[PDB]
Design a binder for this molecule. Structure first.
Ligand SMILES: Cc1cc2nc3c(=O)[nH]c(=O)nc-3n(C[C@H](O)[C@H](O)[C@H](O)COP(=O)(O)OP(=O)(O)OC[C@H]3O[C@@H](n4cnc5c(N)ncnc54)[C@H](O)[C@@H]3O)c2cc1C
Ligand SMILES: Cc1cc2nc3c(=O)[nH]c(=O)nc-3n(C[C@H](O)[C@H](O)[C@H](O)COP(=O)(O)OP(=O)(O)OC[C@H]3O[C@@H](n4cnc5c(N)ncnc54)[C@H](O)[C@@H]3O)c2cc1C
Ligand SMILES: Cc1cc2nc3c(=O)[nH]c(=O)nc-3n(C[C@H](O)[C@H](O)[C@H](O)COP(=O)(O)OP(=O)(O)OC[C@H]3O[C@@H](n4cnc5c(N)ncnc54)[C@H](O)[C@@H]3O)c2cc1C
Ligand SMILES: OC[C@H]1O[C@@H](O)[C@H](F)[C@@H](O)[C@H]1O
Ligand SMILES: OC[C@H]1O[C@@H](O)[C@H](F)[C@@H](O)[C@H]1O
Lengths: 573, 576, 90, 90
């Protein structure tokens, strides 16, 4: 028996933990996955010296933990088996595939992670705020009050994640790209550092934030927090919340301990679901909310008829570029270079402080030292120079988020032919209109690896604005990137597999009125009709958004915790 | 961090952990340093495959493996990229990029050789195959008394097996395992014996195996603790060990020079006993960075002062591979004992069998599983249950087939995972050749190029020796083709091939063992002591000086147990 | 004259090729010469190229050309996977 | 101009490829290290298979090819015959 139970130990469940453990509630958190970021529980797995010295390897860590949500039945023809090998006569259900899934209306890229810390063990840490156009209303009829409220929540969310915009400020590659784009779009678009949840520890190491940053996940009481109460239970699959007969309260949470095999009913005052956008929905549907099985408009749901409808997933376009000769020459614009490289006669110098210098003293010093210590190298950029981290944020005239950077989540084989210092990634992210026909549903027959109802997508990017902006977005990437360099062969401009972006929202969407706003939670993230059931995560977000959604889901979780503090009293210690 | 210990061990792989288990147990104040960090859950240095999620999604684990294997020597890239935009910065030469090694001849490399820097080392992701070597593959520990030599290795191997929890019955009730085992036993009746791959692993449930690791050998928890209140052990992760400092007389090690990667601070650690267990590549690197052997391109015209055999006579196994898709014959034989009423999914479908019937081809445990699968899943066209464990079959190295063999399913898949053919039907074949030690095959270190930790860049100069090594390698390929055909045809996309040299990760002989430094061309004696040094010991596969086909870790561990016996007799622990 | 594996999943009625062709400034240093030792298949001096697209106008136009192809093509449809915008082999 | 090719236009690329002979192919430096130990193998990237050792791979026109047939390349060409405007014309 606990005051609060939280399903999921991602960054959003950790937000609930930090708020509610902090205010003195007795909290239990269950996660279906296990501890594997080392001694700091739920921490970013990229925070090893080894991964940051070998960053091209990290993509493997991400791929290891990302399990595809719905894989349609495979129909690839293999007709060169030996005549002695066993072969089927049909494309039968094999290898975990989902026979419910139409392969042409899928988010083939969508995937889920089952580990303590969730996806924040592996994420890219981009945490931009949404502007009003992308953002749901928390107060209607008063835009200054709405703005004030979001600014308060976002500022709080940013302190939890340690969000900042200074961590790449002395990178030459970063500044080279930032300044070129600033100049080229002067007075049309503004560029800045991607806001990133991260603290720099040294010139060659960044401590990336994670769920662990929000809440350390240590059991309490402990020496540092002797008046607090928290228990984390990993390797526990939460399966159902049990409703009372009147559908006004949750009575227990049914769990299955994956190590012992035991099953229990846990009791709490407050039930918080933060299992991610796909798995929150699964749990809810397995508990008799919305509709199990293939959508049947003729058999309309008892509860939450909008559950798993109006799903949004962003369009994503991507390429990489190889830095222009002109930009590479400009790196060394302030330098005087004499003699020939590799001889005793060679010299590279600059005038410190000269207001005609195109670059600051710290840049010139690093170029100089590099050119002088590595005279065999043809490039002026230092070998350990950090990557670019540049964005121009969503605006009505360019309604897409942009990242101009180097991501550890590369999408094709890492090429080795072109020097890494030259390469920039471009990712532009489009917003998707919520439409009732776009659905996440759960089979009544097929089950997944944890014996829960199999997720199935029925999705296409909506015609009209969504698709028009997607293609405009592609053009914009092509136009903008060319200012920096030509496309890298093997990473030519393309749309990524639907869902690979992992910014799925709207599966259990928020709104003011259940019927009028076709939604499932109110602005306290409380499930309509239920006193004591709260959902957290990107599945709450009901709008078309282009920016990375995590900071916004966190802000909503902060507001939700405010309601919980006003309505439930912690038990005596 | 104390500055003074009884014993310091560089590296937290299973071999370092053997030294720790033996010397912490015996009362020595032990520190262990690892350049890598703690990542595998609450059990320090444990197998990463031991999660519910990986064992329900075993095909994802190849990502974990790939994520932690860092190539040792990548030659300068000479791929022509001639479709860059005319505005892009374009190379005039194939210059040194992306951590490539200009010392490395691309045609005399172990391009697949890789290293892991994490606490527990490579045992965090290995396959756990631990066979013993027979005489032919195995260095001598006793001269001129083969029976005493065998007795000494049995004693060592038995202990090493108990440390790793090696077993040969974890897969005894797998249908796929037995289907393969029985067909191969029958086909080679009176010619070759087949058994389960000896595996370092404990079965915990019908669907979960606790694979062994460094953590199995030694739990890597600091001591003293409640469970060991009189023991003294500290593990220091993210500590790059750079040099052992030799005294001027070249008779003792005086300190271990370390660099803490998090603080940036450097220290000189003092110990009575120094043990290097950094892997076959990195033990050699550390020795060469400390003045042993010869730094730079090999040069006879000035032989090294100390350990002139260091980094020569290196051995790496040839590895051949394919996968097969199970024959129609064998798959039909899975259900040979079943009585099947009517048609699947239809009302009067029943599948039954007679337990104990003498005419039954298979045991009751097999039929019960098949029956239950065919009845619970009548849509599925195969008789193999969905959760049936993988095959784990070998015919071990012999004089008439001088290669080790694994007929199995390895988490370490070599190409993209194929999804079209049902996984129940797929069997992997890996055959492993032995390589003659030759002085010309070398691991050396650049005197100019450095790696990511600023240590001298490893460089290989290697070819499979002509003569027996090469003859055997090609004969082994043919053997794999002929043997595999008895089970099924080749899986397209996994046709029979030699793997990139060194992908097998069984590199030996980089700091090889022998009796006499000069007559046996070696670096350590049979106590694993570096010649001429009182207090310096090397552990790991680099010790093994012979041409072996089987997986070497068990043998390296056995050497390490011997070495601890010498240490316990020659050094006294400090008072507690 | 198609340039990569011809794809069969997208109906060919939907497919349009875009080829934009840049002009290249003549530069003394851009050469075709013939070996005095190596011969071709008909025993004649083996042709050798020494060629880069000139910096300056030629390169600036080539990249602007690429941009114009991405901009114009989008009016008609999006890129076909496997025939994404690229410079072809010189 | 055959009924068969214009009914199967996708196949004509092979005609064109069959008669285009590359002008200058640089010595190949692809590393093939999975040969059987018994196979004969190279110690160096020697001149093989018609390659040109004079050719700098990085200053080439690798796509340049020639056709040796009566009618020359007009046996396979695309037939686009525009005029040059003054800007392009000698
Ligand atoms: C490679 C990568 C890059 C990304 N980069 C960014 C970026 O830069 N910015 C950003 O805004 N977003 C990014 N994201 C997405 C971001 O990680 C998620 O939005 C965020 O982690 C969601 O938080 P959450 O707590 O709702 O869910 P999750 O992090 O998905 O965690 C939910 C959890 O609950 C668990 N669980 C699931 N089902 C059950 C169940 N039945 N019972 C018990 N527990 C259960 C899981 O095991 C898991 O820990 C990225 C994701 C990936 C993988
Ligand atoms: C996927 C795969 C499958 C394998 N399969 C098996 C098989 O089934 N059976 C078989 O016998 N073996 C197999 N192996 C090989 C086996 O893992 C190794 O032989 C074994 O781990 C060697 O142990 P070790 O302790 O000598 O070194 P390692 O496990 O390599 O550990 C050495 C360590 O020292 C550290 N270190 C390195 N340099 C420094 C330094 N300068 N300072 C401080 N620390 C340092 C490392 O971080 C590391 O932890 C496999 C390996 C892989 C990766
Ligand atoms: C697939 C393709 C598409 C094309 N599309 C177009 C198009 O749309 N537009 C256009 O303007 N251009 C196009 N071209 C280019 C056009 O084909 C050439 O510009 C044109 O054919 C050149 O004509 P030519 O007579 O100068 O040389 P070629 O057609 O090359 O003919 C030269 C000939 O001389 C021969 N020969 C070579 N050496 C010797 C020797 N030593 N002794 C004797 N004979 C010799 C040949 O065998 C050959 O028949 C295309 C080319 C091809 C292959
Ligand atoms: O593909 C997952 C994506 O997640 C997004 O949030 C990141 F910003 C992208 O860079 C990418 O990593
Ligand atoms: O390629 C690495 C190899 O290591 C060997 O020891 C294993 F036995 C093989 O199965 C394979 O995993």
């Amino acid at each position: 028996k606990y005051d609060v139970v939280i399903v999921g130990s991602g960054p959003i469940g950790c937000t609930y933990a930090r708020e509610l453990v902090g205010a003195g509630y007795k909290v239990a958190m269950f996660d279906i996955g296990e501890i594997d970021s080392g001694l700091k529980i739920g921490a970013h797995k990229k925070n090893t010296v080894e991964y940051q010295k070998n960053i091209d390897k990290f993509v493997n860590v991400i791929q290891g933990q990302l399990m595809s949500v719905s894989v349609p039945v495979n129909t690839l023809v293999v007709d060169t088996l030996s005549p002695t090998s066993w072969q089927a006569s049909t494309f039968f259900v094999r290898n975990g595939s989902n026979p419910e899934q139409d392969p042409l209306r899928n988010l083939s890229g969508q995937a889920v992670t089952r580990v303590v810390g969730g996806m924040s063990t592996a994420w890219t840490c981009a945490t931009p705020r949404f502007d009003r156009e992308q953002r749901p209303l928390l107060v209607k009829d008063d835009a200054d009050a709405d703005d004030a409220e979001w600014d308060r929540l976002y500022t709080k969310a940013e302190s939890y994640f340690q969000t900042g915009t200074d961590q790449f400020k002395e990178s030459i590659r970063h500044n080279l790209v930032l300044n070129k784009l600033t100049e080229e779009y002067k007075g049309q678009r503004d560029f800045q550092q991607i806001p990133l949840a991260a603290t720099r520890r040294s010139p060659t190491f960044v401590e990336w934030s994670s769920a662990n940053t929000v809440f350390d996940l240590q059991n309490r009481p402990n020496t540092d927090a002797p008046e607090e109460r928290f228990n984390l239970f990993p390797a526990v699959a939460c399966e159902r919340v049990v409703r009372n007969a009147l559908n006004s309260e949750i009575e227990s949470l049914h769990i299955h301990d994956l190590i012992s095999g035991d099953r229990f009913e846990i009791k709490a005052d407050v039930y918080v679901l933060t299992a991610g956008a796909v798995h929150n929905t699964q749990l809810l549907v397995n508990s008799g909310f919305g509709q199990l099985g293939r959508p049947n408009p003729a058999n309309p749901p008892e509860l939450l008829p909008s559950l798993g409808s109006y799903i949004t997933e962003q369009s994503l376009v991507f390429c990489q570029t190889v830095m222009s000769t002109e930009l590479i020459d400009s790196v060394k614009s302030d330098m005087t270079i004499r003699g020939t490289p590799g001889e005793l006669t060679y010299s590279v110098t600059y005038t410190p402080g000269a207001s005609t210098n195109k670059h600051p003293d710290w840049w010139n010093e690093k170029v100089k030292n590099h050119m002088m210590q590595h005279q065999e190298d043809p490039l002026p950029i230092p070998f350990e120079d950090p990557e670019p981290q540049v964005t121009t944020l969503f605006q009505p005239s360019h309604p897409w988020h942009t990242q101009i950077h180097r991501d550890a989540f590369s999408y094709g084989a890492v090429q080795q032919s072109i020097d890494s210092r030259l390469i920039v990634d471009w990712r532009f992210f489009g917003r998707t209109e919520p439409k009732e026909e776009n659905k996440l549903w759960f089979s009544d027959k097929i089950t997944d690896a944890y014996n829960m109802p199999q997720p199935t997508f029925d999705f296409r990017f909506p015609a009209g604005r969504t698709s028009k902006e997607a293609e405009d977005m592609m053009t914009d990437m092509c136009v903008m990137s060319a200012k920096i360099g030509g496309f890298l062969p093997g990473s030519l401009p393309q749309f990524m597999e639907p869902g690979l972006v992992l910014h799925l929202g709207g599966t259990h969407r928020m709104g003011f009125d259940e019927k009028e706003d076709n939604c499932c939670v109110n602005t306290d993230s409380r499930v309509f009709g239920f006193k004591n059931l709260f959902l957290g995560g990107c599945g709450n977000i009901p709008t078309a958004y282009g920016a990375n959604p995590t900071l916004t889901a966190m802000s909503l979780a902060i507001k939700s915790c405010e309601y919980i503090k006003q309505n439930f009293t912690p038990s005596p210690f």
